[PDB]
């Protein structure tokens, strides 16, 4: 639970984006699932996260309008008690105590779930936990744990950004890379049982216990006191169970096990020389492993019965219990011994590429490891390792070697905190590195890592970091920040890379999310042949090195916003396409169907059970279930299962899977070689479905898309293109094309992040998250792909940049010369806040900046300016007192 102290309703142009809920980490990895980094996406914007905003339930960027007593957007002083259960598929919420009338169910149980709140800006929120971490205003539901009870052992609970590493830090950003997932021994048995029981009865006697089957503390009778020969049968079995476990683990530890006074109220135990004998540290570690196994079987038995610390594995178990178990289990060992028997690449923006001069920057290594630093041309690809291609010149200090189209030793190794500086003289075509302020010796007598290289495009600072690696970039905006500059750069006349630069360098890095890109002709194992009396798109791949490819058509078909013979053909809304699998391609690795724009899941293997699906069951004000809407980013059927028995060896023409989409009802149906499949799907209103097939390359010709039509069903192009909507002839306009999912994309870090004034303390009433800084950005939306990209990111996208520049030119032309009606029409598309942000923003492509300025001066400030300028020549003076004055 959590209270908002004061929520600004209209701090900015839009309402405050306040959502609370639970997010599931993807792939059981520390990387969480939800809004992408550096974007206006909160929780509930994908199948990974589930959110609630006071009036709507959010999942996959679509709201559900959940009803509740006094339904309204979250205002000040709202309890908002969220109850998460994962053994069952249900996540419920209660606004101010009254439960919401509808939960989420059948969400993908896998992955680690955590609470998460997207609080936009201009808000004040404060969580609640148990104990000193907060006050529980409302009582938890029966059989539920506290929020803080799930704290990791030996860890202090704290709150931080869910996925982004943004901290609003200048030239000190810890650009952390990928993380980690985060018969001969029967006498020995009897004698070991004897020794164990006598060791225990020594402690029993030290209290003053006697023997007897009854076990009463007042009578001090201990049945185990009697020797194993006369031990009672039940106590004998109890002792023998642990003796058997001990010797079984002794022989399973990888070492063969065979055969080779004190005050006594009862009898006199006679132990061997347990302490006298010396045991090697390897033996100690092996006995420790035995103790770990014993505690593991203990925990396995215990977990059946109460969230105790012992339930944690031995790795995170408390050291006190670990050591006690270790020594207790090692006592028997001593008795035996005595007897003798996704690497991330960051870089500066390509616009700051330098073709000449002397340049330097520093790279930090907080944790030594897979670190490479250097200069690469703009053509470098994120997937390829830095320095592994001719487009990149890198150096790895940990392995002490340079990388450019090959690996060659260079210099010595570095340690934690060893800054590496990059001397680059483009005029001299020299480039080398200074480790901790001293120049490396290369191999024999050289000092330069690379030389004699064509300038080509300007080289850009770049650094690649591997798993569990932390580094910092220092381009040299301020010389005082540079530490070892005065040792090397000052003497040799190398200027800092960004000393003259007025504003901080935008950083472009390899993005984790893979997006669908149009297939290129030069791409390996990717050849799409466009033939043509029905148009076909066949993929005859040749290299076939990659295992599984995901193919998607360029444009989708949208369903009706409200769900409900050539004549009936024209009235109908069903659209048909088909996929034909060429011989030699195994059908069981082919899945044919539809996807939305939210499918970014990538894996070496694809299964329909791994498809991200969550169904929200929205109920009534009376608690009665009425609607159960199921969401998914992938709707296909398996061609192998669709293959009719014997068609894998008897069908010479291959397998044809025809998909029919009825948009009026949101129904997806499949037909296999004229046989209707029992598998069908129902989609939500206003859903955009992309034709897509996933296939593993087993033959040169895998499969082909056919845009033909079946009787009484319109062709796919009719639903794709609005211009061709009534014509049933199949056509293939150039706009339609196949796109394969790829990881070769770059992402831009915003120069200004959303500063959060989180408490960062274990204060009472719960941790406080407050942010009163209004930050906004313009997002350009591609209607065809149903995706959004920041308008600042168009700098590296030349095609979108040019098209948008010409679109702004078209707006200016159509509203030019005082066309007031067109100006009013364009006022809706081009808004006043948009124009103000565009003109004010320092970071902006030049073409877009000029276009927005011209558009502003045309829609507004145009008619009056022109009329006044034209009138300026004339001079008419009224006969008034001011005129006389």
């Amino acid at each position: 639970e959590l209270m908002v102290d004061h929520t600004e309703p209209f701090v900015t142009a839009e309402a405050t984006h306040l959502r609370v809920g639970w997010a599931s980490t993807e792939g059981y990895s520390p990387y969480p699932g939800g809004g992408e980094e550096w974007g206006g996406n909160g929780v509930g914007d994908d199948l990974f996260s589930y959110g609630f905003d006071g009036l709507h339930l959010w999942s996959g960027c679509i709201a559900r309008t959940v009803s509740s007593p006094n339904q309204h957007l979250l205002r000040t002083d709202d309890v908002i008690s969220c109850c998460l259960d994962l053994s069952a598929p249900s996540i419920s919420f209660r606004i101010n105590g009254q439960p919401v009338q509808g939960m989420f169910e059948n969400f993908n149980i896998d992955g680690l779930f955590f609470p998460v709140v997207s609080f936009s800006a201009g808000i004040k929120v404060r969580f609640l936990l148990g104990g000193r971490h907060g006050e529980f205003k409302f009582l938890p539901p029966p059989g539920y744990a506290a929020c803080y009870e799930a704290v990791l052992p030996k860890e202090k609970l704290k709150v931080e950004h869910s996925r982004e590493y943004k901290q609003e830090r200048t030239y000190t950003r810890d650009l952390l890379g990928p993380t980690v997932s985060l018969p001969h021994l029967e006498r020995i048995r009897e004698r070991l049982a004897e020794n164990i029981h006598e060791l225990w009865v020594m402690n029993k006697i030290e209290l003053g216990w006697q023997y007897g089957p009854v076990r009463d503390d007042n009578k001090r009778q201990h049945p185990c006191l009697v020797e194993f020969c006369k031990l009672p049968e039940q106590e004998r079995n109890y002792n023998l169970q642990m003796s058997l476990e001990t010797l079984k683990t002794l022989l399973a530890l990888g070492c063969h096990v065979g055969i080779a006074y004190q005050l006594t109220s009862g009898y006199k135990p006679a132990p061997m020389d347990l302490s006298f004998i010396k045991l090697t540290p390897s033996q100690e570690a092996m006995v420790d492993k035995l103790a770990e196994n014993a505690h593991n079987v203990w925990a396995r038995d215990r977990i059946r019965q109460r969230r105790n610390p012992r339930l944690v594995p031995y790795t995170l178990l408390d050291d006190r219990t670990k050591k006690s178990n270790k020594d207790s289990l090692r006592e028997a060992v001593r008795t035996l011994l005595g007897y003798g028997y996704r690497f991330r690449i960051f870089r500066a923006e390509k616009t700051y590429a330098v073709k000449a001069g002397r340049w330097y920057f520093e790279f930090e290594a907080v944790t030594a490891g897979d670190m490479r630093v250097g200069w690469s041309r703009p053509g470098c690809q994120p997937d390829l390792e830095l320095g592994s291609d001719d487009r990149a010149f890198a150096f790895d200090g940990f392995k002490a070697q340079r990388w450019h189209q090959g690996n060659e030793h260079y210099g010595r190794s570095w340690q934690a905190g060893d800054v590496v500086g990059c001397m680059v003289d483009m005029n001299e075509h020299t480039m080398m590195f200074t480790l901790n302020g001293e120049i490396l010796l290369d191999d024999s007598g050289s000092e330069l890592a690379f030389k004699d290289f064509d300038v080509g495009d300007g080289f850009i600072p770049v650094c690649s970091l591997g798993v569990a690696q932390v580094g910092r970039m220092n381009f040299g905006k301020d010389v005082s920040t540079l530490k070892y500059f005065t040792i090397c750069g000052l003497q040799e006349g190398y200027e800092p890379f960004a000393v003259n630069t007025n504003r901080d360098i935008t950083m472009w890095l390899s993005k984790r999310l893979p997006q669908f890109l149009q297939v290129p002709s030069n791409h390996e194992h990717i050849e799409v042949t466009r033939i043509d009396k029905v148009t076909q798109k066949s993929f005859g791949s040749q290299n076939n090195n990659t295992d599984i490819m995901f193919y998607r058509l360029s444009m989708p078909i949208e369903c009706a916003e409200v769900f409900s013979d050539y004549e009936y053909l024209m009235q109908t809304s069903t659209y048909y396409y088909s996929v034909r699998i060429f011989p030699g391609q195994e059908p069981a690795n082919v899945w044919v169907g539809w996807i939305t724009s939210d499918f970014h899941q990538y894996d070496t293997g694809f299964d329909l059970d791994r498809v991200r699906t969550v169904t929200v069951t929205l109920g009534d004000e009376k608690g009665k279930v009425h609607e159960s809407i199921k969401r998914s980013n992938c709707y296909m059927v398996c061609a192998g299962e669709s293959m009719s028995p014997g068609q894998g060896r008897n069908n010479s023409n291959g397998l044809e899977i025809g998909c029919v989409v009825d948009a009026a009802s949101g129904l997806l149906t499949f037909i296999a070689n004229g046989k209707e499949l029992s598998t069908y799907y129902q989609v939500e209103p206003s859903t955009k479905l992309f034709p897509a097939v996933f296939a593993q390359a087993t033959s040169p010709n895998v499969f082909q898309f056919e845009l033909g039509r079946i009787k009484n069903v319109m062709p796919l192009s009719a639903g794709l293109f609005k211009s061709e909507h009534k014509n049933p002839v199949p056509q293939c306009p150039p706009r339609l094309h196949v796109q394969f999912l790829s990881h070769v994309l770059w992402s831009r870090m915003p120069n200004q992040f959303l500063k959060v004034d989180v408490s960062r303390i274990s204060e009472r009433q719960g941790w406080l998250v407050q942010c009163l800084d209004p930050l906004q950005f313009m997002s350009l939306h591609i209607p065809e792909e149903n995706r959004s990209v920041d308008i600042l990111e168009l700098t590296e996208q030349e095609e979108l940049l040019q098209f948008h520049y010409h679109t702004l030119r078209l707006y200016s032309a159509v509203c030019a010369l005082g066309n007031h009606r067109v100006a009013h029409a364009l006022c809706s598309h081009v808004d006043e806040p948009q124009l103000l942000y565009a003109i004010e923003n320092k970071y902006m492509p030049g073409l877009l900046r000029a276009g927005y300025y011209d558009l502003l001066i045309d829609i507004h400030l145009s008619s009056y300016a022109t009329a006044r300028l034209m009138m300026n020549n004339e001079f008419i003076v009224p006969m008034t007192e001011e005129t006389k004055s």
Epitope: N203, R215, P232, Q234, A294, H295, Q305
Partner: nanobody, 126 residues
Framework: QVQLQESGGGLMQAGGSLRLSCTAS????????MGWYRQAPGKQRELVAT???????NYADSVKGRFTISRDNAKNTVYLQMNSLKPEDTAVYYC?????????????????????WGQGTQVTVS
Amino acid sequence: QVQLQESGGGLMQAGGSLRLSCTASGSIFSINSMGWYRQAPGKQRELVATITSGNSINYADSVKGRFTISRDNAKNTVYLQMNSLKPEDTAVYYCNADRVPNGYNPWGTPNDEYDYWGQGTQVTVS
């Protein structure tokens, strides 16, 4: 999973005879140390007389009265007879079967929590 079902503990006047039957059903391994735990409303939980295999009854401070507890290991069935009843004996009684033999554990923590706590019943005395 070893589940203990306890039936009995009706309500009558003091001095009456009360019969309680506890049956343990589950795994065939680790059957030992059946005990009764008494808890009064909002009061500390006490340990009632505990019987183990071999007719070994472990007594405590709460055994005052007329107790007759007998166990059979063939079906893991325990019969408890209360002859003398007192008003202070009104409490909930839980039947447990823990592998901790007779109430001692030389190993320690890896078995002190090795308890199969079954269902119980409320005994009321007028």
